[PDB]
């Protein structure tokens, strides 16, 4: 692959409960590597993955200044949004931002992203051409007129084509043996009676990275896509992931059921069965 | 420790109103208040506020440095650790100081401006406060020069978060939480980077009599409003922008019959954002 | 590296 | 505003084996707004030294968090996760099932 870098900002007001708060997290693919939280006594951008820790003091200082400025900007954006939507200053509101870049195997830019939301709904987004906006409502149309008047999209495009790609390449290098070496799932099937006439077969995949994976149940080679319980892929807490797929089968017919596992760490797809 | 806050503002005039809230364990109930001096003597004879404490109308007695402790049943003391400190400053207690901007109130984005507060009264401290809800004032010590006391507040690098209406206050030695009346307000506007509009005169800039002159501000950027400003004197005037057939947004400012001309500039701005303007247009000298 | 581009709404 | 109720999974980092050190996880996701209260419980009692991941969100803007604590499972000790959110009238409690 084929990788991505993303930053996620959450700016929240909470009158009477706290000062407005800004939290930022940075991801390379499914791995978080930095964080900033304005509530800390002395807020700093901080490492959240080992492969970024040996990055120099210039990096942390620069990123800390940038985050402090961004926090200021988003507190003001919360006030502005209050005016745009004619809302009271007593309520709690949230602005969210996600942005970043996708690159191909050759490290070159594939796509840039920059999207904003207000109270969990689309607010305004940079288009794929990285030179125009889509505004979701009239408030956002105000923002759009400002940003067009200020040539904001040019500056963002410059970031996404330049720094975003260069740094993603650098991080992919820094963390190569975790970020670019898929960890295949450890797999197994468990069996649990439900009644005297039915039972559950559960196919497990554990300790895999990246998060993308496909678990399917087949019955004599035909997908049970209608009768499969699929749990959301979940973090294990050690920068690997977990998932399972379950199917209810009639008792004594377990042997006719097969679990199929697909993941990039696997050379060829796996087919497991219970005993 | 609880979160103590003042609503709508810790800087509050006499006769106004302010509410202290103590948020602790997802609750606004059951807290006591302390002033900084007697940091273990709960005020009002150890009164337990069942709800948020409403000071109204505000008096000079309300001024001070507060912390709160929330109810904590099972603990060595029946109460929490001290909250964050909130300073209630009560204004309107002395003659107002004066506030001016150097070099001016229109500040280019990214640049710095000096807001000078001064008075003939010997204020020990000056406070600069941007008007708005939950804003923290800046404090400086009053310098003394030839019988006037003064302080220079540096504001910048300029951005929208620093733009707005500012007032400055003085305080005297023994009542640090009591502020003067506010200075006359100063509107600090950030300009740019929004592209400058074009300013023209119709039928032209040379007028005597008897003759009508109209100043048009125009831009292909979608400003909602235009501001016409004359160098010195005459106050700021503003009009809605109207989109024309050629997709320019334009406003026409008719002058006269008085106006003795001068050097004019115009600015664009957007709805619900009165303190951020475009770059200034080229100057236009109007001659009567 | 985070974006140096933060503008107001 | 748009309110979204949290999804909850409670599970161990590794397959449970009585008497072996492990991690207990409570993954909450798909919720909005961001404020939420999560406690891990051991026999009904709040575990104190619990940590969580930094707040983040998915493409649909909904939030997710992982809460986790080190723990050593036994046959008798029963673990669970307790979650409150604006969308919930009462806190939800999801028991840890070693098979889930
Ligand atoms: C006087 C003032 O403006 N702020 C004070 C602060 O200096 C002090 O540390 C705090 C202790 O409770 O009380 C408040
Ligand atoms: C593209 C175009 O022709 N735009 C015109 C502009 O040149 C002119 O100065 C203005 C005056 O109304 O009207 C518009
Ligand atoms: C304060 O600002 C004024 C006005 O710009 C300037 O003349 C003066 O040198 C500054 N410093 C002092 C101490 O007055």
Features:
heterotetramer; A: about 280 residues; alpha+beta; Murine Class I Major Histocompatibility Complex, H2-DB, Chain A, domain 1; Immunoglobulin-like; 2 domains; 5-stranded antiparallel beta sheet; C: about 10 residues; about 0% helix; binds 2-acetamido-2-deoxy-beta-D-glucopyranose; protein homodimerization activity (chain D); glycation (chain D); amyloid (chain D); signal (chain D); disulfide bond (chain D)
**Percent in strands of chain A:** 35-45%
- Topology, number of strands of chain A: 17
Shape descriptor of chain C reads rod-shaped
Helix content of chain C: under 10%
What is the class of the largest domain in chain A in the CATH system?
Answer: Alpha Beta
CATH architecture name of the largest domain in chain A: 2-Layer Sandwich
Beginning-to-end CA distance, first to last residue of chain C: 23 Å
Strand content of chain C: under 5%
**Integer-rounded radius of gyration of chain C:** 8 Å
Question: How many structural domains of chain A?
Answer: 2
The number of strands of chain C is: 0
Total number of helices of chain A = 5
Order of helices and strands of chain A: EEEEHEEEEHHHHEEEEEEEEE
| Rg of chain A, alpha carbons | 23 Å
Roughly what percent helix of chain A? 10-25%
Oligomer: heterotetramer
Report how far the terminal alpha carbons of chain A are from each other: 37 Å
**Which structural class best describes the helix and strand composition of chain C?**
little secondary structure
Secondary-structure class of chain A: alpha+beta
The CATH superfamily title of the largest domain in chain A? MHC class I-like antigen recognition-like
PDB class: immune system
Keywords: Peptide Antigen, HLA, MHC, Immunity, immune system
Assembly: tetrameric
Entry title: KIR3DL1 in complex with HLA-B*57:03 presenting the peptide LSSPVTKSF
Structural notes for this entry:
It is classed as immune system. The complex is a heterotetramer of chains A (275), B (288), C (9) and D (100). Chain B has 288 residues and is mainly β. Chain B has one helix spanning 43-46; strands spanning 3-7, 11-13, 18-23, 31-35, 53-55, 64-70, 86-91, 98-102, 106-108, 113-119, 125-130, 138-141, 143-145, 148-155, 164-171, 186-191, 198-202, 214-219, 225-230, 237-240, 242-243, 249-254, 262-269, 276-277, 284-286. In chain B, strands 9, 11, 12, 15, 16 and 24 form a six-stranded mixed sheet that branches. Chain B has a four-stranded mixed sheet with strand order 2-7-6-4. Chain B has a four-stranded antiparallel sheet with strand order 8-10-14-13, with no helix packed on it. Chain C is rod-shaped. Chain D has a single domain, classed as Immunoglobulins (Immunoglobulin-like). In chain D, strands 1, 2, 5, 6 and 7 form a five-stranded antiparallel sheet that branches. In chain D, a hairpin with a 2-residue loop joins β3 (37-42) and β4. Chain D is elongated. The chains are: A alpha+beta (275), B mainly beta (288), C little secondary structure (9), D mainly beta (100). The interface between A and C is medium-sized, with 30 and 9 residues. The structure holds 2-acetamido-2-deoxy-beta-D-glucopyranose (NAG) (3 copies).
